[PDB]
Design a protein around this ligand. Structure first.
Ligand code: NA
Length: 330
């Protein structure tokens, strides 16, 4: 089997991407944030505290003839941005892009933090990291990918995120039309439950490439590119008037600037992030200070290849017995 679904930016900055997901029978379609940095499929639901719902579409298990309470199971998750959610669990039929899993754990939120409530466009998350991070207790649950895997034509999914445009998540096949050149595969460590890999270095604009190992994760659920402070300082030093603002919470730059590209290494291959991809616009409406898309990972404890980096590539998440990541230009 395979599946193929379009993923759409939630706003003009590509802050996140939503993908329609069918849950239950008859289908209830919710728009979920596919997150390769977490392992829970959770949704706004008929159980979510009413004051914490503001415009989201909810899953109502009582209306699904295939829903069953996973008795005694609870979940609770905290993300890198300080957001959180928790609740109970149902099993139900879940379909993505025509690929169906029966018996998928659907984590129903009873509580969500303010950042979820305030984002009316995201109806929940669909985690795509390794199932060892799933927070369901007392019986940990599998991701949608791990449940689908054995049915798939190939044990892979691919992320093809757009810059200010829709893109695609495919399951079970490589679309050889969706990228240029060849795919370079690199080793993954699953020790922390993430798609963790080591980039071979970077370049700023037309500068020379610096060969240096940068361990980090491929995380579609993170907007920005978080890298070591040395790398990030080297990037923003090429932008006149850029600075790190403790008041704003990262590097800002004059909105009048033209940003340089940023290149990262994948083995001997190179992925180029155009400068435009690194502009996240005014820090507040009408400001002439703009927020940067490359930020320091210092204090986060891991480097994160988030959407800024991933949307410059066609990315293969190879979930074979020895997992690997693949990157191609596009
Ligand atoms: Na922000």
């Amino acid at each position: 089997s395979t599946g193929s679904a379009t993923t759409t930016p939630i706003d003009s900055l590509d802050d996140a991407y939503i993908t329609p997901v069918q849950i239950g029978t008859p289908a209830q379609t919710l728009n979920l944030d596919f997150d390769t940095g977490s392992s829970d499929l959770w949704v706004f639901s008929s159980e979510t505290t009413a004051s914490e719902v503001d415009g989201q579409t909810i899953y109502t298990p009582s209306k699904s003839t295939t829903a069953k309470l996973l008795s005694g199971a609870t979940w609770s998750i905290s993300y890198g941005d300080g957001s959180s959610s928790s609740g109970d669990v149902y099993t139900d039929t879940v379909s993505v892009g025509g690929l169906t899993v029966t018996g998928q754990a659907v984590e129903s939120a009873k509580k969500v933090s303010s950042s979820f409530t305030e984002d009316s466009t995201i109806d929940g998350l669909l985690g795509l990291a390794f199932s060892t991070l799933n927070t369901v207790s007392p019986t940990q649950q599998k991701t949608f990918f791990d449940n689908a895997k054995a049915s798939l034509d190939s044990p892979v999914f691919t992320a093809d995120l757009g810059y200010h445009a829709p893109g695609t998540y495919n399951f079970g096949f490589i679309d050889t039309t969706a990228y240029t050149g060849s795919i370079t595969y690199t080793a993954v460590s699953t020790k922390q439950g993430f798609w963790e890999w080591t980039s071979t270095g970077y370049a700023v604009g037309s500068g020379t490439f610096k060969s240096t190992s940068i361990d980090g994760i491929a995380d579609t659920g993170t907007t920005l590119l978080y890298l070591p402070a040395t790398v990030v300082s080297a990037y923003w030093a090429q932008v006149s008037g850029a600075k790190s603002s403790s008041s704003v919470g990262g590097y800002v730059f004059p909105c009048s600037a033209t940003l340089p590209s940023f290149t990262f290494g994948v083995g001997s291959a190179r992925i180029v992030i155009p400068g435009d991809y690194i502009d996240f616009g005014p820090i507040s409406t009408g400001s002439s200070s703009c927020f940067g898309g490359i930020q320091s990972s210092a204090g986060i404890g891991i480097n994160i290849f988030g959407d800024v980096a991933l949307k410059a590539a066609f990315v293969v998440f190879n979930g074979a017995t020895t997992p690997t990541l693949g990157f191609a230009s596009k």
